[PDB]
Amino acid sequence: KRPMSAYMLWLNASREKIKSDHPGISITDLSKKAGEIWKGMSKEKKEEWDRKAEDARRDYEKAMKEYE
């Protein structure tokens, strides 16, 4: 669904910098840290990640039409 895909695009793009700023962070604490950063981001920035994910979903669906 759209919230999950928007979050996944953002976190994959941001994971390296978040981890670099938190040396030694555990798997579990990184999951929690990322959740807090997302909640702190502005509504507009999160809508921007949703727009990027919707673009990628549309591209995938188009390419899958070509495949099938």
UniProtKB/Swiss-Prot annotation:
Residues 1-68 bind DNA. Phosphorylated by CK2 following UV but not gamma irradiation. Phosphorylation inhibits its DNA-binding activity. It is found in: Nucleus; Nucleus, Nucleolus; Chromosome. Residues 30-68 have a biased composition (Basic and acidic residues). It comes from the Eukaryota. Interacts with MYOG (via C-terminal region). Component of the FACT complex, a stable heterodimer of SSRP1 and SUPT16H. Also a component of a CK2-SPT16-SSRP1 complex which forms following UV irradiation, composed of SSRP1, SUPT16H, CSNK2A1, CSNK2A2 and CSNK2B. Binds to histone H3-H4 tetramers, but not to intact nucleosomes. Identified in a centromere complex containing histones H2A, H2B and H4, and at least CENPA, CENPB, CENPC, CENPT, CENPN, HJURP, SUPT16H, SSRP1 and RSF1. Interacts with isoform gamma of TP63. Interacts with FYTTD1/UIF. Interacts with SRF. Interacts with NEK9. The HMG box DNA-binding domain mediates DNA-binding. It has both affinity and specificity for DNA damaged globally with cisplatin. Component of the FACT complex, a general chromatin factor that acts to reorganize nucleosomes. The FACT complex is involved in multiple processes that require DNA as a template such as mRNA elongation, DNA replication and DNA repair. During transcription elongation the FACT complex acts as a histone chaperone that both destabilizes and restores nucleosomal structure. Autoantibodies against SSRP1 are present in sera from patients with systemic lupus erythematosus, but not other rheumatic diseases. Belongs to the SSRP1 family. This is FACT complex subunit SSRP1. The lineage of its organism: Eukaryota, Metazoa, Chordata, Craniata, Vertebrata. The gene is SSRP1.
